[PDB]
Design a protein around this nucleic acid. Sequence first.
RNA 1: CCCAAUGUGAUUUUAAUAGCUUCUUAGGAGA
RNA 2: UCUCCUAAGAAGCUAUUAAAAUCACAU
Lengths: 928, 182, 186, 73
Amino acid sequence: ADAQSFLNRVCGVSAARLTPCGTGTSTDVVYRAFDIYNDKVAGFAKFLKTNCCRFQEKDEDDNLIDSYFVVKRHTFSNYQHEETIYNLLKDCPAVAKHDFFKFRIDGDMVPHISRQRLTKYTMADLVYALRHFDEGNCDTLKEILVTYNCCDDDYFNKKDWYDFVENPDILRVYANLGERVRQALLKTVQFCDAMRNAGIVGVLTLDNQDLNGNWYDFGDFIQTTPGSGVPVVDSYYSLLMPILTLTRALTAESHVDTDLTKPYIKWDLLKYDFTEERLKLFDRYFKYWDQTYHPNCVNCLDDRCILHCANFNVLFSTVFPPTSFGPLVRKIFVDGVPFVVSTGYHFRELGVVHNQDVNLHSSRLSFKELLVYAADPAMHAASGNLLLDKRTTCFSVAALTNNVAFQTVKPGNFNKDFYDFAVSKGFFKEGSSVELKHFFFAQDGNAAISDYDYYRYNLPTMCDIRQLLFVVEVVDKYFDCYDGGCINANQVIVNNLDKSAGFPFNKWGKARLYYDSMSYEDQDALFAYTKRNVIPTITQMNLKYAISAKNRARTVAGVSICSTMTNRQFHQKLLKSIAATRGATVVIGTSKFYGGWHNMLKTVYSDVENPHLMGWDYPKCDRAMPNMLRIMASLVLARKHTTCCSLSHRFYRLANECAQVLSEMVMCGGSLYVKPGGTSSGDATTAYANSVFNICQAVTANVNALLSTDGNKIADKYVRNLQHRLYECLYRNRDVDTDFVNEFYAYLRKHFSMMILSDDAVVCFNSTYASQGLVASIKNFKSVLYYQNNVFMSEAKCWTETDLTKGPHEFCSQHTMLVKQGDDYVYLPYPDPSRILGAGCFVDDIVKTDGTLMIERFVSLAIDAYPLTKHPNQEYADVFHLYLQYIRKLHDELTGHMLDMYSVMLTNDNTSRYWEPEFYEAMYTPHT
Amino acid sequence: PSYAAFATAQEAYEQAVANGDSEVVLKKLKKSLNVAKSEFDRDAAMQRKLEKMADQAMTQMYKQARSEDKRAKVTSAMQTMLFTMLRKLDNDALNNIINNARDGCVPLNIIPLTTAAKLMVVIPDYNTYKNTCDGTTFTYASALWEIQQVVDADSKIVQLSEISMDNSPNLAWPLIVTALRA
Amino acid sequence: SSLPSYAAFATAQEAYEQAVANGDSEVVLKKLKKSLNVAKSEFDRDAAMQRKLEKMADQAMTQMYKQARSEDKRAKVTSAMQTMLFTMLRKLDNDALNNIINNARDGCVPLNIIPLTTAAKLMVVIPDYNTYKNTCDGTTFTYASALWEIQQVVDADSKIVQLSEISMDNSPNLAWPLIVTALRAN
Amino acid sequence: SKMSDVKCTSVVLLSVLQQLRVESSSKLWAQCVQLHNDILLAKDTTEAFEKMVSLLSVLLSMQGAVDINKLCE
RNA sequence: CCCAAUGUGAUUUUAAUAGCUUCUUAGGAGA
RNA sequence: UCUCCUAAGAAGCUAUUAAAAUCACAU
Ligand SMILES: O=c1ccn([C@@H]2O[C@H](COP(=O)(O)OP(=O)(O)OP(=O)(O)O)[C@@H](O)[C@H]2O)c(=O)[nH]1
Ligand SMILES: [Mg+2]
Ligand SMILES: [Mg+2]
Ligand SMILES: [Zn+2]
Ligand SMILES: [Zn+2]
């Protein structure tokens, strides 16, 4: 009855057609995301709201719209407080309406504050739903994508609609949010100007802005000098940052007068320096960010300043034309003839860089200068034909020859004598648990360019910087165990010199030729030049010929010798220290033999309470990896150079690594293409940079798991204080807190124990904490790889194990078994039987098909097959005995052919030990 | 000289062994013989040591001589490449983009777009042909181009009359189109 | 054993053992032990030369075998692969593979890749009426253990031939080999 | 074991086509590669024996490339 | 023609050092 | 005269390590 008089008062003096969203005089209840920091709780988490009565508008013909009136019951003082603040901030067009009124309930007067024509959801609900994505709980994201016309409600019936790789059209559906978010950004700058000119102080948070962009809830602000108004924004912009690239928000900056209905800006084609445009973009959206921005990173103060300033450059470099980036070239005279050569670079992340040792006139060239000119793509690209290659979406520069090259892949050779032998022993019968699954797959001439096009999956990715600048200090604690620094050419170790030197030297010789042609002072002079100048280089793409279970091709990057020779002299002292250490998190350099597998597992199990095992593998690790995370990996490895390199030397080396193995002119099929980002697998640090990236995503998942947990539900006061201190160090302190970084590293290392080797990891973790949200679980990795790696991680690629007596399901493609060996039990590795039988049946050369030439090839495969003898499945245990029976046959035939050929017996009768188990058992027992 | 002492002492001892004149004097001749043999073993061992060091000296010199020949061969090969590429740059078309620049410096990626006399277009299907290369002249990179030749993936020449929706299943895609700036 | 020095070593150790067993005086045993030590040392020096020279031969046989047999495996590769394939195709014993291989021996070879989908087009060469008599019946053709519908038939001069003209008596008037074009029946 | 005999025969058959220089015809090699790679991934023998009839028909269509009347005796 | 970075294991060959054994030479000690 | 110890040279064996070539596996 009486509720009608309340409904008529909530309309006010306005024309409105309201309907009640619940019971007529009591409050409504909703679950929403909030950025909160208080004496009792801190985090970015989802909480119940109960202090509001909701009404919704109908239109002029009886249908509902996204326009709500949200009334709230307040105390008396705060009601007046918010009123005072609003009146001063009332004429801002960025502020929502605030109706302060009173009304009788339960027989007495209560004040109310009505906010008019708000959306259903806030900016915090859009930010939370894209960070914390779960494919089984998408109902808030689905309602935002439909309420604002991003897609029809029928779009969600598609197979894998959310997956960036299987449904790449989702990148067009998320980009329809771009103008909505960019209007909210503008309205924040109008509101900050109003707070400053009105003399108001306060923190502004994503939960207090609607999805049109309007601000409300002024009850926590205070008054000051009218010219001393100051808005706090560190958590607002940092939580929002990864959504700005995902929704392509600044895409309206490419158009005339920045209107999506007008044509594109026709930029001057010769223009390479955009420094004043980058500064104009920063004041347009980030005016109150309160930290110095350097458009060109040669001006930065330290690693942390380089990460700060490069994160804004990945946003702004999406406005400028693709032809503006890459080498900057100048005309120079050598013995009177004019060369064209590189005298700088323009980076999407690092800005413009100019070389310090440029000479405009030269009389003669040394061997060191001929190498730099030869490596420089300038002369190769400036003298080649123009290329329009429609087989790919990657940017094509020039064709170096009048013909295109097409490279095919041929099938593997069939070793019929081993297959006929196996079939005689009862192998390959129908319904058997062991069968052929590994083969050599043939490919057509489009093979190469088809594998190179997977670099499409590398999208520009802005990070949360407040989060990344804490994670980078915890990731570094995993590398305090090792020494590092520069070395002379006298001390560099090379594994094999009979390998390709790259382009364009693969036409004159192999790495050995250059290493023999250059004295140690030509090599040290070439290294010292890179600390003051950028050398850009060409990279080949080479197809791979090897056995596989899946039919896709594989390509590897043939990195040039100017790059390979000098990167090896900067990093090798550290990379040799990582491989010499035992018992650490990174397990590069540790053998599986003589007990080493049992030692690695007893180390990851550590002293974890209620422990559980889990693991994962990155999909397209090299393709997807963001440039911000490949830059951070090189900065973490370079921290060892504090004693021998200045701030300026450590920059050019970074710039070099960016110019040579991140952004590159790749040569493929005799033609040049611009690589968009990510790893190149012939890079001297490949396995070691993958391992730093893999720790970073696993540290990030634990920051997100703890800050998204409700702090009122945590029972242990130690973990409430850990969550509270973590929010301050992340989003309110601006310098590193060494005492907390050590405490979070110690917490993490007890409750969440890792073993890591490139893009492969095993974790042993406290399940009681993981089920309460106090440490990461597989849902916290699915979420992080979605907003920070642009990949959907399928549950078909993950695992978890409850019983530690079974060990990890798979690490390095090897299964584990607990077996008795002597007086005690040990963990042993075992391969997939089809990988070992497939390698015997199919080979990559014709001479490998005669077993009498190749007896030692079967001895090596029997060393990997030995642990199968201890398996409960007899069809697996028989695979080792097949190899031992074959090794005997090959020696009987070799002896027969040798006697028929020479009429004299062989004197080396020692072959008899290779067909007995004692030679192989000794490979898996300790004490060598 | 130690070998001569050993050989002459052997003859002096061997005559006394033949007649067994006296064990005492045999020892005297024998001690002088085995002392000479000890000096001979020292000299012969050193001769064998020096003979092995001579091969180590010559083989190190051949590794130095082969390393200087290979330096001298690749130095003139790198110069032959650089001074060859230099005789292709459009020295008039190129001077006009470099002279227009603010500071005489330009992106590399605009040099082929603005100065190259020739274009290669690689086309994967007939829908892409019809949209990009239809007819005999076409526009790309804000310039006009004329088609001089088309070839298929097998490098066989294709006439422009053969590229149609009906005949497209018979051609070896991709086609490569060569055009000149006009 | 049987090296030149072995007789001196063997007779010296026999004499040394005989003297200690007989209880002879220690100065005689010292002379026997010393003459044994030098004969043994010369035998060991001869045996060290033998074992080094035998390794020199055993490496030469082994590497010469690998060289001469790697040449043999790489030379006859085209004749080995073709012989291997036609040995494996017999073991499969599939009716379609047997039917097309038996037809290809007589020259009844296809001009297309044989298609798998219904109503797709096949073209096959027919060498003589004695082939036609076995593969064809009315409008139907039987090949790769499937039925096909004859669409048209063509002479060596590219002239069309009607299905009523193909008969034993009229066969000398056609320009063989004939071509039959057909479509896969359901 | 035909499942495995068929997969092994497919590897030998494409090796014979590759040695007869079929790679010198991009339009034909791209079909042999697809038939070969499908037979290896197959799980039903009826699919694999139908794709084996298509792949073997390439070799039989090349008149005079192999002396089939001599290889069958 | 093209054929990357890095780790681990097996096999063969060569080089350096340690121990053992025999002869020769030299010096001292005991008898 | 005889024995032992010490010092040197030669012969031989064994052990360890290093280096070179080769094969196999892992990302
Ligand atoms: O031969 C190799 C293999 C791998 N790698 C390096 O190891 C990384 C992981 O190698 P993986 O074997 O995990 O493959 P992948 O992630 O590239 O592909 P998926 O099967 O997961 O789709 C690659 O991204 C590359 O950087 C090499 O450098 N060389
Ligand atoms: Mg992976
Ligand atoms: Mg794994
Ligand atoms: Zn900066
Ligand atoms: Zn340094």
